[PDB]
Structures are given as C-alpha cells and as structure tokens.
Amino acid sequence: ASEAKQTVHTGNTVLLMIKGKPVGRAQSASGQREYGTTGVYEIGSIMPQEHVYLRYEGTITVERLRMKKENFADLGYASLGEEILKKDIIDILVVDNLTKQVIISYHGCSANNYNETWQTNEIVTEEIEFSYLTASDKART
Amino acid sequence: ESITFKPLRVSSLDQIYESIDLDELNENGIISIEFVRNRTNTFFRIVDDVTTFNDKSDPVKAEMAVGEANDFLVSELKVQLEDQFIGTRTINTSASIIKDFIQSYLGRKKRDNEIQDFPAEDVQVIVEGNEARISMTVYPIRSFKKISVSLVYKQQ
Amino acid sequence: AVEPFPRRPITRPHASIEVDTSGIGGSAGSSEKVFCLIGQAEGGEPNTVYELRNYSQAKRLFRSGELLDAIELAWGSNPNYTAGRILAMRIEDAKPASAEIGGLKITSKIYGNVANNIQVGLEKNTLSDSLRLRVIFQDDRFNEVYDNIGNIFTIKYKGEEANATFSVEHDEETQKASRLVLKVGDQEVKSYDLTGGAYDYTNAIITDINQLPDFEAKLSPFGDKNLESSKLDKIENANIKDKAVYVKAVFGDLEKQTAYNGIVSFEQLNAETSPIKTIEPFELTKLKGGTNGEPPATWADKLDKFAHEGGYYIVPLSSKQSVHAEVASFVKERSDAGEPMRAIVGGGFNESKEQLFGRQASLSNPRVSLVANSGTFVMDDGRKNHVPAYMVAVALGGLASGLEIGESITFKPLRVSSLDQIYESIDLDELNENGIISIEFVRNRTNTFFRIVDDVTTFNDKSDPVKAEMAVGEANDFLVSELKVQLEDQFIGTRTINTSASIIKDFIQSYLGRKKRDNEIQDFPAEDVQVIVEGNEARISMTVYPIRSFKKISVSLVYKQQ
Amino acid sequence: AVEPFPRRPITRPHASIEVDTSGIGGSAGSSEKVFCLIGQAEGGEPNTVYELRNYSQAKRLFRSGELLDAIELAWGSNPNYTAGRILAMRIEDAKPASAEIGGLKITSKIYGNVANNIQVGLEKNTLSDSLRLRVIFQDDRFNEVYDNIGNIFTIKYKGEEANATFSVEHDEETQKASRLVLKVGDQEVKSYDLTGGAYDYTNAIITDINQLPDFEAKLSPFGDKNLESSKLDKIENANIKDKAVYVKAVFGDLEKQTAYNGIVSFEQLNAETSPIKTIEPFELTKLKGGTNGEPPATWADKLDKFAHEGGYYIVPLSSKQSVHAEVASFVKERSDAGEPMRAIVGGGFNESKEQLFGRQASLSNPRVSLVANSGTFVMDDGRKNHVPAYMVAVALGGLASGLEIGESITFKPLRVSSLDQIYESIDLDELNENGIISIEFVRNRTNTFFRIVDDVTTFNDKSDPVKAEMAVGEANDFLVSELKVQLEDQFIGTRTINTSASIIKDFIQSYLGRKKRDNEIQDFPAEDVQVIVEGNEARISMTVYPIRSFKKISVSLVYKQQ
C-alpha cells in the first residue's frame, strides 16, 4: 500500500523522460520486440531440433494529450514536413519516480507513424510511434 | 589510421640506415624514412609514427594513432555532455541516467567502428549536488606491426 | 559513524576529461546490513570510525593499506553479490605533524608518517603591506596560495587639519585588541569597542566611518574580508591624513581562508601570561612529529567503539588468537545486549589442519566462523597479491553482506585466482565435520571455480541448525531484532494507554504472517506462541522452523543392451 | 601449467625471413582433452609441468631427450587426429652450473651438464674506465658481448676555485647509496640525500646539476645509461675541475645490459656485515656444477603435480615395473576425486608374449591399457628411431587425445614404418582376450598399413563393457562429469521446501533429451527414471543404453558354374 513497500510498479511510480525533460500529460506507452525466432526442421524427424534468432525488430508507442505548449511538434522531438530529415535519433528513458533511477532505456529511437485527433467534447489526443535500434536495461545494478 | 609504412614522393635521400641503426633510432623515439626495393620497384616509406616521448608503457603518450583518435573523441564527447547536462536542473538528473547516456554514446560510436568494443558494465557514476564524477573503460584501436616466417626444404 | 568528507566548493561550470591508468573503482551497493572492518591503514583519524559509500572516499581518506585492499575485495568479489556499506577504523594510533615558525603553530589534518612531508610558509607582499601564504603537500602535489592576507580596508582623512591619528587598544587579560578610535587634532569623533554589540562586524564600522564627512573607509577587493570586529590587530597611532592607513586582522584573515585548506590548521603562537609572538613571514618548512605510533596490545577499546552501529558483520584483519577472543567476547556481549553480530576469522598462511583444530579447540562459538584457506587475488591495476586467510575472510564477509537474509553463502562461487593448498575430498570432510569452513575447487570442460562448500561456525554440534549454520541463525537474528524494535516503538515508545496479552499475541501473529507472504519464512506453528504480563514486564515465547537447504544427491547408472 | 618462457617484445616493424633445415616438426591441434607425459629431458627445470603447443618451443625448452621423439609422434601419429595440448615434466633433479669469480656469481637458468659448456668472462676497457663481458655457448652457438659496462653520466666543474670534489656514500647496514655530494674548493654547494624524491633518478640529477652555474652534466654516447642513484658505487673526493668525473655502478649497469640472456644469471658476492665485494675482471671461465640427477625409485611425488590439472591419457616413459605400479594407484585416486584419469603403458623392447602375460597379471586395473608391439618410426630428421613399446603407446595416446569422445582407436592406421613382431591369428586372439593391445600388419593390392586391432584394457571380465573397453569408459567419464556439475549448480544452492522428486525427474529427462538430440548417446528408457526424497537428501536411479560398435562379420561363397 505504501509508496516504498509496494513490490509492483504502478503507473504512478513510473516517470517518462526525453532529453533531460519529463513528458507532460503522458497517458500510455507500449514497447514490443521480436527476435525473429525460427525453428529448424529436417527430414529425419518432424520435431524441431533447434531454434535460432534471425532479425531484431523493436518499436515503442506513446500517446499524449496535446498541450497548448511543449508538444512534440513544438518541442522538435517530432516533425511534420521535410524537416524530419534534419532530425537526429532520440533516446527515451522510463524512470522510477521516487529516486530517478532508470528502469529501461530505448536507444536510437526514430519515428515511424504520427497520429492526431480532434473531437467535439473529448480532449485532443496526440499519438506517435517510434522505431529504435536497441533497448537496454542497465545502471540498475 | 597511422602514417606508418605509407609511401612518399621523395626522389632520393641523403642517408640510409642499417636495421640495427633503425632499431636504435626508432626505440629512441625518432621517425625515419627507409628505402625499399624488390623486383625493380622502389619506394620510400615511413617506418613508424612514434613520438619523442620515451615510455612505451603508455601507447596514448608514445604513438600518434592513439593520441590523434583520443584527442577528437574527448572533444566530441565533451561538447555533447556540456549541452545535455549543464543547462538543466539537478533535481531531475541522477547517476543512472548519466550512465545510460554514456552507453548510448559509446554504443553509436561502436556502430561507426571508430573504436573497438567496450566493457559497458565498467561505467559507473557518482553524483553530489551540482557536481558529478565519471569513470569509464574503453579498448583502443590496435595495429599489426611485425611478423615472423621460416622455411624448410624437404627435397621433395 | 561519520561520513567524513563534504563537498568541495567549485568555481566554474565546466566539463573536464583526463586520461589515467586507473579509475574510480568499486561502489557500495544497496544492502540490508553494514560491514565493519579494522586493520592497518594510512590516513584518517585513529580511534574514529568512518562510513564509506564509494571506493573513492576510501582512497581519499584511508589513503593506503591492507584495509583499503580489503574494501576492494568486498565490492569486487562479485558484482551480483557486491558488498554493502562499510564502517572502518584504523588500528594504528597515528600522530599529527607540527611546525611552529613565524608566530604560527601549524599542524596537519593528516595523521601518520606522511604528515612530515607537508610544507607551509609565509611571504611578505611588499606591494600592499601584506603577508602571503603558500601551502604545498608534495605527496599529493596539492599546492595552495593566499595573498594580501590581513588587510581589510583603508582609511583616509580628507580634511585640512594638521594631524589625524588612528589607534587600537589591547586587553592583556585575554590578549584581545578590542577598540578602534579616530582622533584628529587632539579631538575624538567616535570610538568602536570591538567586543560585540554596536560594532560586532567591520561592516558596521566601515558604514560608521564612511558617514563621517571627513573620512572614507574603502574595501579591499583582494579576498572576502567581512571579519568580526574583535579580530582586528593591535594598531598604535597611525597617521590617517597620510596616503593610506591599513586596518589589519592578520590572524582573522588567515583563520577564515586557511579553514578551507585541505591539509593545514593554524594556531597563533603565544610566547613561551605571555604576549603574542608576532605572525611574520618565514621559510616554507616541513612539518615534523607526525608518526604512525604503535598498535594497542588489546583491541577491546576499538571494538567497544562499534557498539550501537548496526553492523551485523565484523572482520578483524589479523591472525592473533587473543584478538579473536576479544572479538568473540565482544560479540557475545552485544548479542545479549540486543545487537546481534557475526565475526569471520582466518589466520596465517597454509596453516596446518591440526593448528586449525587447535584454534577450534580453543574457540567453539556459534557467533564466529573460522576460515582455513589462504590464496592470492588479482586486483585493480593488474597487481595480484598473495595474502593471508583474513583477507579471504573479507571476501566471505563481503559476499555474505550482499546476499539476502534467507539465502546462504553455501556453494556460491568465488573469484580468488588461486589457493595455497588444494584439499582433497576427505580433507574437506574433516574440516567441515569439525566446524571449519573451506573452499573447494572444481573444473569444467574449459572453466574452473572456487566454491564455498558449506556454512558452518566454530560450534561443532550438528543437532541445532541455528548454532551450526550462520545463515539460519542470521535469519532468526534479523527476524527477532526487527520484530522487537518495531514492538518497542508501538507500545513502549509510542504512548499506549492500554494493552492486553492477547493484543500482543495478535500483533505477533500478524507480523509472522507478513513474513510468510514475503517468503522470508517457510512455515511456523501459529498456536505455539505464549505471552505473559507481570506488572510493567511482559514475556514472549514463540517458535519458528528454520529453512533447510539442499545438500546431498546420490546417483547410480545402469547400462543395458538395446 | 607453469607458463611457457617468454620472448622479447617487438623492436621494429619488419618481416623476418630465415631458413632452417628442420624447422617445425609439429604443432598442436584443436582439442578439449589434454595429453600428459613424463620422461628424460635436457632442458628446463625439474619437478615442473609445462604447457606445450609447438615443437620448436619444446625443442628449445628441451634441447634433447626421448621427450621430443615422443612428442613428435603425438602431433604426427596421424594426419587427421593429433594429441593437441600437451603437459610435460622432466623426471631427474638436474642442477645448474655456477661460477664465482671477481665479486660476482654466475649461474645458468638451464639445468644440466651442457650448462658447464657456457663460458663467461670479464675484460677491462681502459679507453672508457669500464668492463666488457663476453659469453660463449658452443652447443647453442649463443654468444654475447657488451662494451662500456658500469658507466653513468659524468659531471664537470667550471669555477675558479682550486678544487671541486664529489663523493658517493653508502648505508652501513645495507651497502646502498645514501648520500652523494658536490663540493667547491673548501666549501660545499649541494648534495642529494637518497630518501626518495628526485634524488633517486639520474635523469633529474642531470637537470639539477646542470642548473648549478658552475657545474655541467652530460650523458654517455652509448645508448641510455639511466639508473637509480641507489645503485651508484661509493666514490670519495672525485676531482671535478681538471677532468670530468665518472659516476660508476658496475653491478647495476651490467644487469641491465645483460638483461634477458637467461643462459646466464648474476648474483653479487657477499665477501666472506658481509660487504659487497668489488667487481674484478677475469678471463672466460667454463661454468661448473651443471648436472643431471638420478631418477628416484618412486615418482609418486612427481605424479601428484599433474593432479587437479585436467589431464587425460597419461603416459609414463619407462618400462620398469615400479613406475607402472605407482601410476595405477595414482589414476585410481584421480577417479575417486572426480577427475578421472586413464593411462597407456609399455614394457620396453619386450618382443615376446610370455613377459606380457606376467605384466598383465600384475596390472588389471580398468583405468590402464597395455600395448605389446615395438617398432621403428621415421622422424622429421629421418633418423630410424627404433624405440621400445612404451614409445608406441605414446602414438596411441597421441591419437586418442585427438579422436572424438564417442569413437574408438580400433582399426585406425598408424605412421609406423616397421615393427619387430607380427603375430598369427591365434596369437592375436589369445593376446587380445588376455586384455592386451596389439598392432597388426595388413597388405592387399599393394597397399600396406599398420592398424590397432582393439581397444580392450588390462581388466579381464568381458561381462562389464564399461570396465573392459575404452570407448564405454571414456564417454562415460565425460558424461558423469557434465551431469554432476549441472546437478550441483541447479539443486544444491536452493531451498528444500520448493524441491521435490517429480521436478528432479523432469530435469533428468530434459538433460537426457537434449543429450540424445546431440546424438552423443543411444536412446534411453525415460520411464525407468525414478527418485526418492527425504529432507536434505535425495537418491536417483536411471537406465541408459550405450553406444555400440560393429566388430566382426562372416561371409561365404558359392560357385554354380553358371
């Protein structure tokens, strides 16, 4: 129940950072990976003798409520026009709120999809999809 | 890459030295130019890149290749660190985030192949107030210099 | 304990990078418990315990010695089981070095034979009628310089009158000089007693003098000088109408600035009621008299210093049998007092198993374990050191510190490069059966391990696991100690109006149930608890089953046709 | 193993090409298991185990002996299968040669008679106030000469005074240099006290002396001459004005220039405090005392060194029964201690069967195997090396250490040019059934080989293939070693409460399941596995089928005239 004693990361305990700033009004974040695993089969038997890894695919999703200031478009972390070619890679960190310790990091993030919605009575929702080169979980120990 | 063993335009030289003279001269920490001829093909070559500093125990001090690459590396790393960290609040910064940044910087550096692989785990940090201290371990770029061969005739 | 070193003040925002042969080294990891060590060590205050969170602090304060090597073993033995926080105290009763030249008694913040390599000197700055200081600590190459020392502000009298005189009086009872009077043409304007009250600081005096239409007191820009008024120097009849009259606090300026020097302390020499020996320039001269002293014959006083510190594990870096007895007696006292502890001991090189039994015969105590093996370790900078057993004891202590309460050190690997002797299977059995903890060697296809065969204390009987296995006893120790301290807070400490025996029983059962939910304890009897209350006292009795580890496996193979 | 002797680091980048008649006669092949040997060897030092990888290193390390002949076959016994990594150790307790003349003691790291042929002498060089040293070694054709030995940078004086005097003074309890002084006329100018600091380094002293306006310091022309001031010879009143003064350290400079040169090592003679005697020139002198000792009746102390070193297929290079008795007991203990061993032996130039039956009667341990034949091998040099049986055993051992785990040495070829004995079919049958290995000659269609008939060991009972034959035992030995390590890691360091019989059973099936996929074993009856658990103890039984091998066939012929 207490802040420190809870063994499980609630959404409250977690903080999301980009380039030395927190991301305000964040709502969701998902990370998916595929090692390109395959099975080896031969004439001798149907059963797969071994499994091997072929290709590494890594994507992370983020959703956000469009603030009147400090949006991804305003902040330059995301781009709309041809300016994207002038945007370098980005690194994302997911952080423990209590001590600012690191939980997991995404390296070499680059954008894939950018989505935006407006509606009569809902809050403006901003979504973006990032593809990255590697993901590492170090500096914890 | 080093200047070692690469050719030169020079038509002729005043002096040519013996192998022992080159060895003594090279070990003293002095650059020399050697003449090579084989199969009617003549060049003048840089024997080595060692500097005036004496101690071979410090390659970063003795040789140009280590120092030159090291000089640019620190210049690039220093600029990035100053921009990322200095103009930010201490409260949101900590040791762990610093450690991740370094690994990412060394990660992208390795992909470019400007360095050999590095022991990511060796990196560790301390933080106190407005001050922080960092230590890291990295391996250099080597270079193959000498070889040895032997011959045997078995009459068949 | 004391975390000795606070921040260094900084001057500029910058990033600096410098190649080196060595790095910052290890670091203390998160830990439930604390690890205490005593040993030969250069640097630091004798008979004082220091807490260390990083190897950098250990280098910075425990400048060298086998103790510092022990810390490296504690954190470097296993990255997964890195040792926790550290408490350290040097056995050697080192002395400071001292220099008494130029009206100043100069002493070293450093204690030991190194302290004589400190050089300090004063110089005369003819440019501003001021003294100058330089401090060089050659071994650490630490160079410091101060200039314009003593001069705070200048006074000019601007009027046409014949003579303006500045005077400061002296008190001989306390040796202070606490008056400052401006007189012009045998007439006085104001007098400032420098004994607090109206003119405690020189700032108010400067404000007071500046208000006078015929005078101006102007601040010296060379160094912050807002000293208290009482620190002004003895001054007698200085002509204010002249080009410049200086107001001086030579010791006061020294006292403030020199406090920030990392090597030196300053005292003002009283002549040998004797007046003050004048502070004057002198040659940069070595300090003298700093030594390491000798270790005490008995370490009991040192061990008593660690009482009420919470360090569960303590390791003396020695092989002396008497010293081991002192620790065992000390640990016995603390355990009964309410502060459980464990001691890890190991002596000499390749000591005979019979001598090990001799130590066992002399000493049989569950609170201590005796390590037999001696070996060599590869450490920072590539140096490999061949060391006695008590350095191996640190590795066991550092390992056990990192491990959780419920997990034993049994069978875990160790990084030690090699061992003096390779015990056989029978040799190992004799040691373990006789309450001796040892190290075992095994070889893979292309790998080699050094393993801790089992947890055993000097106590021999196998009947009771808590007595034999320190891991089991440790689990009981932390369970009870954590329970009681919590219980003290709720009922004794916190104001409780009423309490019944049954209420205590429920609270105990609530506590135990939580531990099981955290997997700290496997099972226990719920109905076995007993509570009795008698006036102002209560008796509590309960039982919990110790955890059992996996020891033996026996295998047989049968070959057959088809 | 004791590390192989090093080599000088790179001097210059180049391509060194040379010609030798013999060159490399062999080298190590990729392997996991290791091959061990002991025998007579001229080189190295005794009671030491060395790691061999190439023939040239062993040849240089062991200049002569039966060892290299045994080694050469092992790396060339078969084109495909080679022994791989080898451990070797010389039996006899050889000693180095020595000489003690002119304040110096000369000793050779090489132990043996040949060391006496080393000639070392000192010559006086008046042109530079120095000594020359020459070494001659006929057998290795190793010669070394050095000039201007014992000279350190000179000093000269420039002032007016009648004299400038220099001295070097020594510690009375160590004979080390403690102080050296420069003096001008009747007055002293400077001195350097050898207590650390810049006073240790002649490089700094050159700078410090040059800084003096009246003194000059200049270095020798023959390469570097830097040396610590501690090594400087005692000098008194060296006149600096008229001529430059030479700084002397004959011992220090000699050691540096003669560095490496392991054929010769130097010790300074303590004159009969035993003062450091002055070094004197002396004519070239043959060393003495270089000897090769006798082999003791018991090599058990020698054999124990190989324990805990991961060896396999040991081969002792001797025929006498006493050695074979020791090793048979030794390997037995190795099997007990979880590091199983196997051995291959020979009986000399037996060339007869009846003696073998007596020997086989003596030895019937399953862990040892005997070979009967003796023959001639052709070396790289081409010598018709006629050798006893126990050299042929090495070829078998060299082949076996290269062959894979699950295959036998049976029926495979051999390099041997010729044999002393060829047997009948009945003789082979009787010999084979007795439990003795033999080599047979086969010729058909003008194609001749020598083959290993079988792999049976000295153990008699055919009813136990695991005991009788190498293929079952070798594979079985590795299997248990791998399984044992995994089980210890998985289970021992865990709590009993979460462990049970069923999980143990599943683990075994998975281990045997993945083993079967690798095809290292035949299929196994998974159901047969069953377990019992009680407290900290558990018992396991399993059934497995071995790897078979097809040996004999039978054919018949019929002609039907059409």
One DSSP character per residue, A4-65 reads: TT--S--TTTEEEEETTEE-TTEEEEEEEEE--EEE---SS-SS---EEE---EEEEEEEEE
Using the Cβ of C557 and the Cβ atoms of chain B, whether some distance falls under 8 Å is answered with: no
The answer to whether residue D18 neighbours chain B at the CB level (below 8 Å) is: yes
Q: Is D79 left (phi over 0), alpha (psi -120 to 50) or beta?
A: alpha
Helix axes D425-434, D354-362, angle to 10 degrees: 10
> Which chain C residue is nearest to residue B60, measuring alpha carbons?
C19
d(CA B13, CA C29): 64
Strand partners of residue D538: C553, D533
CB contact C79 to A (< 8 Å): yes
Using an 8 Å CB-CB cutoff, list chain B residues near C381: none
Q: Are the Cβ atoms of C19 and B86 closer than 8 angstroms?
A: no
CB-CB: which of B5, B27, B152 is closest to D13? B5
Q: How far is C307 from chain B (nearest CA, A)?
A: 30
Please check whether residue C493 touches A, CB under 8 A: no
Nearest CA among D557, D398, D383 for reference residue D76: D398
Q: What is the resolution of this structure in A?
A: 4.3
DSSP state of D82: -
Q: Does B81 touch chain C (CB under 8 A)?
A: yes
Q: What is the C-alpha to C-alpha distance for residues D226 and D203, in angstroms, rounded to an integer? A: 6
Question: Does residue D531 contact residue D504 with C-beta atoms inside 8 Å?
Answer: yes
Chain C residues within 8 A of A141 when measuring between CB atoms: 29, 79-80
Query: Distance between CA atoms of C10 and B128, rounded to whole angstroms?
Result: 12
**Contact (CB<8Å) C19/B70:** yes
Window C:488-527, CB contacts with B under 8 Å: none
Give the list of residues 6+ apart from residue A86 with CB closer than 8 angstroms, or none: A79
- Which chain D residues contact residue B149 at CB under 8 A? 15-18
Q: Which of B75, B63, B57, B54 is nearest to B2 (CA)?
A: B63
Contact between A140 and B95 (Cβ < 8 Å): no
**DSSP 3-state percent helix, strand, coil across chain D (nearest 5):** 25, 30, 45
D466 CB neighbours in chain C (<8 A) are 559
Distance from CA of B82 to the nearest CA of C (A): 6
Instruction: Tokens for C55, please give them.
Output: 């190897």
Alpha carbon dihedral C125, C127, C129, C132, in 10-degree steps, equals -20
Judge whether D94 and D253 are in contact, CB under 8 Å: no
Residue D423's SS3 state is coil
CA dihedral C79, C85, C91, C95 (to 10 degrees): 110
* C501-517 helix and C470-487 helix, angle to the nearest 10 degrees: 130
Give yes or no for A2 touching C (CB within 8 A).
Answer: no
CA atoms within 13 A on the CB side of A4: 1
A6 to chain C: which residues are within 8 Å by CB? none
Calpha distance C529→C142 (Å, rounded): 64
Phi and psi, residue D161, nearest 5°? -55, 155
Contact check, Cβ <8 Å, D536/C550: yes
Q: Is B101 on the interface with A (CB under 8 A)?
A: yes
Q: What is the full DSSP assignment across D466-515?
A: HHHBHHHHHHHHHHHHHHHHHHIIIIITSBSTT--HHHHHHHHHHHHHHH
- D16–B146 CB contact, under 8 Å: yes
Rounded Cα distance, A87 and A18, in Å: 14
Instruction: Look at D545 and C557 and tell me if their CB atoms are within 8 Å.
Output: no
What is the DSSP code string of D101-137?
ETTEEEEEEEESGGGGG-EEEEEEETTTTEEEEEEEE
Contact C82, C53 (CB under 8 A): no
Interface test with chain A among B94, B100, B109, by most A beta carbons within 10 Å: B100
B5 part of contact set with chain D, CB < 8 Å:
yes
**Span between the terminal Cα atoms of chain A, in Å:** 25
Strand partners, A38: A52
Does residue B74 belong to the interface with chain C, where contact is any CB pair within 8 Å? yes
Q: Give the separation between CA D265 and CA D279, rounded to whole angstroms.
A: 15
Using a 10 angstrom Cβ sphere, with 0-12 exposed, 13-18 middle and 19 or more buried, the burial of residue D397 is buried
Q: Do B19 and D24 touch (CB under 8 A)?
A: no
Residues 6+ apart with CB under 8 A from C310: C33, C34, C339
Residue B50: count of CB within 10 angstroms of its CB = 19
Give C79's contacts in chain A (Cβ within 8 Å). Answer: 141
For chain B, how long is the longest CA-to-CA vector? 81
Q: Which residues of B touch A101 (CB under 8 A)?
A: 94, 96
Cα C401 from Cα A136, distance rounded (Å): 28
The subunits that touch chain B, with at least 3 C-beta pairs less than 8 Å apart, are A, C, D
d(CA D420, CA D375): 5
Provide the β-strand partners of residue C508.
none
C-alpha B41/C-alpha C336 separation (Å) is: 91
Cα–Cα distance for residue pair D67/C60, rounded to 1 Å: 56
Q: Hey, is the C-beta of B120 within 8 angstroms of any chain A C-beta?
A: yes
Query: Nearest to residue C180, comparing CAs of C234, C239, C255?
Result: C234
Residue type, C558: V
Q: Say if the Cβ atoms of B107 and A134 lie within 8 Å.
A: yes
**Helices within C338-376 (DSSP H only):** 353-362
Measured in whole angstroms, the distance separating CA D273 from the mean position of its chain's CA atoms is: 40
Closest approach of C84 to chain A, Cα-based (Å): 13
